[PDB]
């Protein structure tokens, strides 16, 4: 109620006069800004919306509601010197311009303005304008808090102060930090936004010193001693600067307290009440009462749609021939209609997030271990989609340009042999031409295929981009289920995508897979997908590997970069992390089950730029982020429940054996051991992707190398056709297999379903052997045990002879 009175008072103070309806409007605005913000559920907000109107019209009869209180109520001070109502569009334009300025001023990361973030900007600004205005932003991990607070603080000129808690950071250090910020805010009259985060608010012992500041603006006992004399001197100097002559120490201290009320603000940032393990649990209700609480929530369908459109607008997702489907599935009810290709693609990009949320909820329903899904997952997905789209389009354009160059050189060679026919070498030139033209025709059809590949690129990248971003924690079966759901939804929207996509093949060249297998990579579909996730990651990865193979894989891959091993449990962990961040060597950190919170900004990449010095806070220190730094978090425990704070800051990579993973491994082993012809026809079905065509045109590279090396010596024997015949064979061969890609697929399906009960029996047997632990402590058997049993049963079986 006192905050309500203060809000109306600050609204009315610069105003010379008002009508009654403007007073009612300010009253309703303060009601919404004090009560509707803290609410979590949308229907509660609707109830508050209706009840404000009801109370107003009950106690202010004969005042017309339309003029007095319109639903889009906004008050702002940026447009005009007075705190008066403003329209949505003008504020949108101003904030957009200032945000585009903010991009190239303090932090170079795009920040989309959607309907549910402009409101938070206005709320944060409002609490900044009030006296003793402290904000408590509570909401899902990510979503803008610690980025909107910094943004509005920059806009309003408030120098941002953030506490840097070290180990052995006694209460005296917090006392000294509070002394410094209080001296700056009160004596020097420098507005400060005192930002505090749950990471550095791990200890609740120091958060009750802050309650006195929040409630009164002065914390007695801070400046006791000679510090009182120095603060009195500086305070009287500041008062003289402001033009007030004060003598008594009590009056000077009161004026200092008033200045601290006016200037210093506190911005707490918290996650919802999932921090039961912390000493806070639910933090004290006094802290909730002292601050103004703001529920950030999670991005709705419209927010995802808008933050997707303005991140994928630079991409060329335009198709003039996009036939809209007769009945489309929609997540965004306000999609433009009839939707275009860009609109449909962004709607599908939001379908990815919605289906992933539904899948995680379903996994929670069946008792499985769920993982928090946050807006940063969507941002990472969109970034991966953009990078992958650019990469694949660049590759295809390069190949098409090279083939056009090849056609030019083929025509040049045709001209050369025609010149040589102007001149018994001459007779066999009729044969070489008969080869050359054929090759030309072949290359022409190849060019035509590239056009079709263009038409298929966009959706394909989508179905891969999501896979790199979202389905990293899930098991193989749910990975495939999610991929099938996404593919079906893309098919429903008439977005063109490859029918038989291989994720592991579409995202990696065979040289990279060979290099990984040269390293300690167990060669499986799940393991190859995970290895790809360790290559195309924007956020640092979390490797859940009970076997321990993946740590050795990472170590062997990055040995050239001098990667070093560390663990959280190690005493010399923080200093090793400091060295790795300072110098840029890659790092692997093990046993992240005991995750230290000091790594929170490092995973979030919260670089603070000052001149050429790019600082990041770690404990007491502010260390210089070297460009080369990369960190890989690791977990030998596969049974872990990470906080939602860490999930948004890291991408998961699960090297865990499950029923379907072992089933697939065993089935592949049987197909390799007992029906090697089907193994060849299966590996050849995943080589009709990039491998064989890449080799087919890499032979054209050597052809064109040895095609223009001519000074009339092309007909040394009129037997250059051999080099042109070596490409005549393989083409037809890789044209046969492309034609025989449905017969082979059906054949491998029919032959693999035959050997499937053996695979299910294998998975059941191994998981029973794993279950044997809780019968007796000695009954412990590794997966190497079962795989050695299977090698004996398949290869060293005398009964099969």
Partner 1 sequence: QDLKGVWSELSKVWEQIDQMKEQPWVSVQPRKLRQNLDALLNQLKSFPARLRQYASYEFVQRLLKGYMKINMLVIELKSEALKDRHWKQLMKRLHVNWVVSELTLGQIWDVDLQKNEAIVKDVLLVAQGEMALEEFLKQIREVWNTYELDLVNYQNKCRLIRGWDDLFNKVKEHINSVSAMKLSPYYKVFEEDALSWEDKLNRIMALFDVWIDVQRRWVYLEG
Please give the annotated binding residues for ATP, written as ranges. Answer: 139-146
Between 574 and 649, whose beta carbon lies closer to partner 1? Answer: 574
Residue 180 beta carbon to ligand ANP: minimum distance, rounded to whole angstroms? 24
Among 95, 293, 359, 580, binds partner 1 (CB under 8 A): 580
DSSP-assigned letter for residue 81: S
CB nearer ligand ANP, residue 97 or residue 109: 109
Q: Please report how the helices 756-771 and 783-794 are oriented relative to each other, as an axis angle in degrees rounded to 10.
A: 140
- Report the partner that residue 453 touches, choosing among partner 1, ligand ANP, none (CB closer than 5 to 8 A by kind): none
Residue placing its CB nearer to ligand ANP in the complex, 143 or 748: 143
Decide: is 572 part of the binding site for partner 1 (CB under 8 A): yes
Strands in 651-654's sheet, in edge-to-edge order, are 564-567, 587-590, 631-635, 541-544, 651-654
Nearest to 655 by CA among 761, 568, 529, 770: 529
Q: Which residues are annotated as a binding site?
A: 139-146
Is 631 one of the binding residues for partner 1 (CB under 8 A)?
no
The two tokens of residue 545 are: 């590997």
Among positions 358, 430, 628, 764, the unique one binding partner 1 when judged by CB under 8 A: 628
Which of partner 1, ligand ANP, none lies near 626, with the C-beta cut-off 5 to 8 A by kind? partner 1
Measured from the CB of residue 393, what is the shortest distance to partner 1 in angstroms? Answer: 18
Toward ligand ANP, which CB reaches closer, 630 or 721?
A: 630
Q: How far is the CB of 153 from partner 1 (least distance, A)?
A: 18
Q: Which two tokens stand for residue 537?
A: 């990651």
Centre a 10 Å sphere on the Cβ of residue 573 and count the other Cβ atoms it contains. Answer: 18
Structure tokens at 170: 């006694």
Binding partner selected for residue 725 from partner 1, ligand ANP, none, CB under the kind-specific 5 to 8 Å limit: none
Interacting positions 603-622 with partner 1 (CB under 8 A): 611-614
The beta strand positions in 83-191, using DSSP E, are 84-85, 135-138, 159-162
Considering the complex, what minimum distance in angstroms separates the CB of residue 760 from partner 1?
49
User: Considering beta carbons, is residue 141 or 487 the nearer one to ligand ANP?
Assistant: 141
Which residues contribute to the site for ligand ANP (CB under 6 A)?
109, 111-112, 117, 141-147, 197, 269, 271, 307, 376, 379, 645
Residue 112 interacts, among partner 1, ligand ANP, none and using kind-specific CB cut-offs from 5 to 8 Å, with ligand ANP
What is the C-alpha separation between 302 and 336, in angstroms, rounded? 12
- Of 350 and 625, the one with the shorter C-beta distance to partner 1 is 625
If you write DSSP's letter for every residue of 539-602 in order, what string do you get?
SPEEEE-SS-HHHHHHHHHTGGGT-EEEETTSGGGHHHHHHHHHH---EEEE-GGG--GGGHHH
Measured from the CB atom, the residue of 572 and 775 that comes closer to partner 1 is 572
Among 21, 49, 190, 624, contact with partner 1 (rule: CB under 8 A): 624
CB of 191 to partner 1, least distance (A): 20
Residue 575 found at the interface with partner 1 (CB under 8 A) = yes
Of 35-43, 358-366, 423-431, 579-587, which segment contacts partner 1 by CB under 8 A?
579-587
Helix %, strand %, coil % of the chain (to 5) = 60, 10, 35
The length of the chain is 801
Q: Are 671 and 682 in contact (CB under 8 A)?
A: yes
Binder of residue 141, out of partner 1, ligand ANP, none (CB less than 5 to 8 A by kind) = ligand ANP
| Rounded CA separation 385/468 (Å) | 9
Question: Is residue 168 involved in binding partner 1 (CB under 8 A)?
Answer: no
Q: How far apart are CA 470 and CA 486, in angstroms?
A: 12
Identify which of residues 379 and 650 has a Cβ nearer to ligand ANP in the complex.
Answer: 379
Which residue's CB is nearer to ligand ANP, number 91 or number 688? 91
Q: How far is the CB of 379 from ligand ANP (least distance, A)?
A: 5
Q: Do residues 352 and 466 lie in contact, with contact meaning Cβ atoms separated by under 8 Å?
A: yes
Neighbours of 536 (CB within 10 A): 18
Partnered with residue 292 across adjacent β-strands are 135
| Tokens coding 81 | 């010197």
Using CB under 8 A as the binding rule, whether residue 270 contacts partner 1 is answered as no
Q: Which of residues 72-111 bind partner 1 (CB under 8 A)?
A: 104-105, 108
CB of 612 to partner 1, least distance (A): 3
Q: Which of 60, 25, 192 shows the shortest CA–CA distance to 11?
A: 25
Helix (H, G, I), strand (E, B) or coil at 621: strand
Residue with tokens 């008594």: 248
Q: Which residue has the tokens 């089935």?
A: 667
Select 143 or 266, whichever has its Cβ closest to ligand ANP. 143
Q: C-beta of 384: minimal distance to partner 1 in Å?
A: 21
The C-alpha angle 682, 686, 691, rounded to 5 degrees, equals: 130
Is residue 585 a contact residue for partner 1 (CB under 8 A)?
yes
Q: What residues are paired with 195 via a beta bridge?
A: 162, 267
Q: Footprint of partner 1 on this chain (CB under 8 A)?
A: 104-105, 108, 562, 564, 572, 575-576, 578-580, 582-585, 611-614, 624-628
């Amino acid at each position: 109620m006192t905050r309500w009175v203060r809000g109306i008072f600050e609204a009315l103070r610069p105003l010379e006069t008002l009508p009654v309806e403007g007073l009612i409007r300010i009253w309703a605005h303060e009601a919404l800004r004090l009560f509707q913000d803290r609410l979590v559920e949308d229907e509660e907000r609707r109830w508050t919306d209706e009840n404000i109107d009801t109370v107003a019209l009950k106690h202010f009869p004969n005042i017309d509601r339309e003029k007095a209180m319109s639903r889009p109520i906004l008050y702002s001070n940026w447009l005009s010197k007075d705190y008066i109502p403003v329209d949505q569009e003008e504020l949108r334009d101003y904030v957009k311009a200032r945000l585009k300025v903010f991009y190239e001023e303090e932090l170079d990361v795009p920040l989309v303005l959607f309907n549910e973030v402009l409101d938070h900007v206005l709320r944060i600004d409002r609490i900044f304008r009030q006296p003793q205005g402290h904000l408590l932003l509570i909401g899902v991990s990510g979503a803008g808090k610690t980025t909107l607070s910094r943004f509005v603080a920059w806009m309003n000129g408030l120098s941002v102060y953030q506490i840097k808690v070290h180990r052995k950071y006694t209460g005296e250090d917090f006392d000294e930090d509070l002394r410094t910020v209080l001296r700056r805010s009160g004596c020097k009259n420098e507005k400060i936004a005192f930002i505090m985060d749950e990471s550095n608010v791990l200890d609740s012992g120091f958060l009750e010193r802050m309650n006195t500041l929040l409630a009164n603006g002065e914390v007695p006992g801070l400046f006791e001693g000679d510090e009182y004399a120095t603060l009195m001197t500086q305070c009287k100097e500041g008062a003289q600067k402001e033009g007030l002559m004060l003598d008594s120490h009590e009056e000077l201290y009161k004026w200092f307290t008033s200045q601290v009320i006016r200037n210093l603000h506190v911005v707490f940032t918290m996650n919802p009440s999932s921090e039961g393990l912390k000493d806070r649990a639910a933090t004290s209700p006094a802290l909730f009462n002292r601050c103004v609480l703001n529920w950030f929530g999670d991005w709705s369908t419209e927010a995802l749609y808008q933050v997707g459109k303005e991140f994928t607008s630079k991409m060329d997702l335009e198709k003039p021939n996009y036939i809209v489907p007769d009945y489309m599935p929609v997540v965004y009810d306000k999609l433009p209609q009839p939707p275009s290709h860009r609109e449909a693609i962004v709607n599908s990009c939001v379908f990815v997030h919605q289906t992933l949320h539904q899948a995680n909820a379903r996994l929670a329903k069946r008792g499985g271990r769920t993982m928090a899904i946050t807006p940063r997952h969507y941002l990472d997905f969109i970034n991966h989609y953009a990078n992958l789209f650019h990469e694949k389009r660049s590759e295809l354009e390069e190949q098409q340009m090279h083939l056009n160059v090849g056609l030019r050189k083929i025509k040049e060679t045709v001209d050369q042999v025609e010149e040589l026919r102007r001149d018994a070498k001459v007779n066999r030139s009729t044969a070489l031409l008969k080869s050359l033209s054929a090759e030309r025709e072949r290359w022409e059809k190849t060019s035509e295929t590239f056009k079709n590949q263009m038409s298929t690129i966009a959706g394909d990248c989508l179905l891969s981009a999501a896979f790199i971003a979202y389905a990293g924690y899930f098991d193989q079966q749910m990975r495939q289920n999610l991929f099938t759901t996404w593919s079906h939804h893309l098919q429903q929207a008439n977005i063109q995508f490859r029918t038989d996509i291989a994720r592991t093949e579409y995202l990696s060249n065979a040289d990279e897979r060979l290099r990984w297998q040269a390293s300690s990579l167990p060669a499986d579909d799940l393991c190859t997908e995970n290895a790809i996730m360790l290559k195309r990651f924007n956020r640092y990865p979390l490797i859940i590997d009970p076997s321990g193979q993946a740590t050795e894989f990472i170590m062997n891959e990055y040995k050239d970069r001098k990667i070093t091993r560390t663990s959280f449990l190690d005493d010399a962990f923080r200093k090793n992390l400091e060295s790795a961040l300072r110098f840029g060597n890659p790092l692997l950190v093990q046993d992240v089950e005991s995750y230290d919170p000091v790594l929170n900004p490092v995973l979030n990449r919260e670089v603070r730029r000052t001149g050429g010095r790019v600082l990041i806070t770690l404990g007491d220190q502010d260390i210089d982020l070297s460009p080369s730094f990369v960190i890989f978090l690791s977990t030998r425990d596969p049974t872990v429940e990470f906080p939602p704070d860490l999930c948004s800051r890291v991408t998961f990579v699960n090297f865990t054996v499950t029923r379907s993973s072992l089933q697939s491994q065993c089935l592949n082993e049987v197909l390799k051991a007992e029906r090697p012809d089907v193994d060849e026809k299966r590996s050849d079905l995943l080589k009709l992707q990039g491998e064989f065509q890449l080799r087919l045109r890499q032979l054209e590279k050597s052809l064109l190398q040895a095609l223009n090396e001519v000074k009339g010596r092309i007909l040394d024997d009129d037997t250059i056709i051999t080099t042109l015949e070596n490409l005549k064979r393989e083409a037809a061969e890789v044209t046969r297999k492309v034609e025989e890609t449905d017969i082979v697929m059906q054949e491998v399906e029919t032959v693999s379903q035959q050997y499937l009960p053996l695979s299910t029996a294998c998975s059941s047997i191994y998981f029973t052997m794993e279950s044997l632990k809780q019968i007796h402590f000695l009954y412990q058997y590794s997966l190497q045990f079962f795989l050695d049993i299977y090698h004996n049963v398949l290869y060293e079986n005398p009964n099969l002879k």
